[PDB]
Structure 1
Amino acid sequence: RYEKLDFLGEGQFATVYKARDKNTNQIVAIKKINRTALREIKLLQELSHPNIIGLLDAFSNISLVFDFMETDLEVIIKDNSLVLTPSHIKAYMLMTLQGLEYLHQHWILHRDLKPNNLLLDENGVLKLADFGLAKVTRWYRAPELLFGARMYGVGVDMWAVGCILAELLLRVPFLPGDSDLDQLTRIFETLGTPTEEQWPDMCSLPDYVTFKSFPGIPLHHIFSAAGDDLLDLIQGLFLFNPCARITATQALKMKYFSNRPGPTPGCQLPRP
């Protein structure tokens, strides 16, 4: 029922192809990989937010149809020819946080936030992807997960948002750990080792271990081109206590989003 146009990329997780719609000639992408599946599929079809990937139709052979996107935030970040102005970063952050807020309001965690999961269309609209039921990521992993927490919440997605913000500002991954232990070392060397005051109940985590006491590097020295409003946003996203860490609604109300300059409109966002 769909007209296969091109080959975008393949993997054991999903087989992605570029295709055209046979009802309204709209270019869409298809991910080819049941009563229990329909329960999750109809819930995903019921979701509707401009900054969240839309599930238009499905196919028995597990085939899912979503809107077509040009690139993701990873392609943009790696493009040396592209220049990310403060207004460009603010636009990507506003869209990411607006999409995350919708998911959290509907009790859905992304669980895998990273640049290649924030996709962009021809009109400069960011949409989150890869969050519906499981049928490199260590760099964006929150410290509670690295200490083996089995029960977790919104802080897991919020920490990853801070890592994406830091990657837009530095143009390289913020904390590129070589292992789960090195990831915790990089977090503590950079942000400081948390105390029982900063993170109460840290010692009760399943894989809790005592690290060397690091003072940390002041956020203003790390992000030398950031203003005080942006430094406050970064500080809230990287609080050690998962309960104290800023939520998507709290982040959207920060003075950063209401201050000048404003976000770059979609049509003016850089395209590769």
Structure 2
Amino acid sequence: ERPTFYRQELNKTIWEVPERYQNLSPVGSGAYGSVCAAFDTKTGLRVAVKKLSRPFQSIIHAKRTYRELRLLKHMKHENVIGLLDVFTPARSLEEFNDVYLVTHLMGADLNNIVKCQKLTDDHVQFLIYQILRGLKYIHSADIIHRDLKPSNLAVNEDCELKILDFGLARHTDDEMTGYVATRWYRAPEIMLNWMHYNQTVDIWSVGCIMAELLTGRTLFPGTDHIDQLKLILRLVGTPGAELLKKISSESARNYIQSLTQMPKMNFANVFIGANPLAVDLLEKMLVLDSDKRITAAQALAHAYFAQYHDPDDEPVADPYDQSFESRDLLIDEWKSLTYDEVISFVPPP
């Protein structure tokens, strides 16, 4: 009933996996783990296998491990990554120190698309439609992605798209510094820690992604946090008093008021030649005040997606209990919770 596992070393990491998974090759690595492509001989699928790096080394790691397993086990939607398998070579809780996660392999991400391909407005409609369909689902579970960007969007040959998070890195201060794509898609309220944020950050990211699909260029390629803010405020205008009072960070508020006031620009003169409906949708996503941004559910009903929108096939998630988020436990308690979730996993039929 327990499969047989075999061992191999790949780039200084030992991988111990069931025999069903063959031809493992390294695909990515970071502080939190490593990923290989493989062939699943049981299902005939090409898969990605993520080996978490010392998942129970600390409370933050143990909870992160638990969190990712909880999320992936819940995600059951065409446009969101799902869990094919989860395994450990451990035969008991006492032996349990490693966690491996298995999903559908994707190679191509949206960067591959935007920089190689010439996307028509039809392609842009279909790609952004699928992001929004996925996001409606994710948000319906009160899950916030927070790191939407082209490298976290997998896209196949038929332009079919899935949202994931390939994050093997700590978004450290250094990682968010300078002329870096790690920060270019972030809502300004989270980039600058303006206030307590919510799921609306993800819609800002979608606006940035949609713009870049339309133009082939990064929307806000800031050289640093402040330069990026300036690029943002140039396009969308400086904040009015109503938004300024919502910036609960007094230092951040005081800074943004130092800036000379600027009006929102004409997006038709920015996105020259774009479908007017794309321009209208961008205007509704790229609103500084996150309270006033369009939601994923609202966006799906926008005329730009008339060709794709089916209100009977834009499903919501089952209830997702994230009461664990506010719970403090010891490493071994997070570990046993995680082990229970590994043990209870039922594969997709």
TM-score of the superposed pair, with normalisation by structure 2: 0.68
1:134 Cα deviation from its structure 2 partner: 8.8
Amino acid at match of 1:154: Q
Which shows bigger deviation, 210-219 or 237-246? 210-219
Q: Is 1:62 equivalent to 2:99 in the alignment?
A: yes
Which of 7, 31, 39 matches 1:20? 39
Which of 73, 86, 110 matches 1:45? 73
Which shows bigger deviation, 214-223 or 105-114? 214-223
Contact 2:194 2:248 in 1 (8 A): no
Tell me how far apart the structure 1 counterparts of residues 168 and 25 of structure 2 sit (CA, whole Å).
Answer: 27
Sort the Cα spacing of 1:19 and 1:41 in 2 relative to 1 into closer, same or farther, 3 A: same
Contact 1:5 1:18 in 2 (8 A): yes
Q: Secondary structure at the match of 1:243?
A: helix
Sort the Cα spacing of 1:182 and 1:67 in 2 relative to 1 into closer, same or farther, 3 A: same
Which shows bigger deviation, 161-170 or 207-216? 207-216
Number of equivalenced pairs: 257
Sort the Cα spacing of 1:121 and 1:227 in 2 relative to 1 into closer, same or farther, 3 A: closer
The answer for the alignment partner of 2:248 in structure 1 is: 204
Task: State the Cα deviation string for residues 94-147 of structure 1 (Å, max 9, x = none).
Answer: 100000100000111111000111101344320000189999222111121233
Q: Is 1:98 equivalent to 2:117 in the alignment?
A: no
Tell me how far apart the structure 2 counterparts of residues 43 and 143 of structure 1 sit (CA, whole Å).
Answer: 26
The sequence identity of aligned pairs, in percent, is 39
Q: Is 1:191 equivalent to 2:228 in the alignment?
A: no
Which shows bigger deviation, 162-171 or 212-221? 212-221
1:42 Cα deviation from its structure 2 partner: 4.2
1:152-191 pair list within 5 angstroms: 152-191=197-236
Sort the Cα spacing of 1:203 and 1:116 in 2 relative to 1 into closer, same or farther, 3 A: closer
Sort the Cα spacing of 1:115 and 1:30 in 2 relative to 1 into closer, same or farther, 3 A: same
Amino acid at match of 1:120: V
Tell me how far apart the structure 2 counterparts of residues 85 and 123 of structure 1 sit (CA, whole Å).
Answer: 14
Task: State the Cα deviation string for residues 77-105 of structure 1 (Å, max 9, x = none).
Answer: 111xx211010000000100000100000
Q: Secondary structure at the match of 1:162?
A: helix
TM-score of the superposed pair, with normalisation by structure 1: 0.86
Which of 16, 21, 29 matches 1:10? 29
Which of 297, 300, 303 matches 1:249? 297
The answer for the alignment partner of 1:219 in structure 2 is: 267
The answer for the alignment partner of 2:320 in structure 1 is: none
User: Structure 2, unaligned stretches of length 5 or more?
Assistant: 1-17, 57-61, 88-96, 171-180, 309-349
Which shows bigger deviation, 199-208 or 10-19? 199-208
Which shows bigger deviation, 206-215 or 108-117? 206-215
Sort the Cα spacing of 1:134 and 1:103 in 2 relative to 1 into closer, same or farther, 3 A: farther
Sort the Cα spacing of 1:181 and 1:45 in 2 relative to 1 into closer, same or farther, 3 A: same
Tell me how far apart the structure 1 counterparts of residues 201 and 147 of structure 2 sit (CA, whole Å).
Answer: 9
Which shows bigger deviation, 40-49 or 61-70? 40-49
Amino acid at match of 2:74: E
1:11 Cα deviation from its structure 2 partner: 2.8
**Greater CA radius of gyration, 1 or 2?**
2
Sort the Cα spacing of 1:30 and 1:229 in 2 relative to 1 into closer, same or farther, 3 A: same
Which of 142, 167, 171 matches 2:187? 142
The answer for the alignment partner of 1:268 in structure 2 is: none
Tell me how far apart the structure 1 counterparts of residues 51 and 195 of structure 2 sit (CA, whole Å).
Answer: 31
Sort the Cα spacing of 1:39 and 1:72 in 2 relative to 1 into closer, same or farther, 3 A: closer
Q: Secondary structure at the match of 1:27?
A: strand
Sort the Cα spacing of 1:131 and 1:104 in 2 relative to 1 into closer, same or farther, 3 A: farther
Q: Secondary structure at the match of 1:103?
A: helix
The answer for the alignment partner of 1:117 in structure 2 is: 152
Contact 1:40 1:133 in 2 (8 A): no
1:40 Cα deviation from its structure 2 partner: 5.0
Task: State the Cα deviation string for residues 209-264 of structure 1 (Å, max 9, x = none).
Answer: 22221234310111012232111100110111111111100111111111xxx46x
The answer for the alignment partner of 2:123 in structure 1 is: 88
Sort the Cα spacing of 1:6 and 1:39 in 2 relative to 1 into closer, same or farther, 3 A: closer
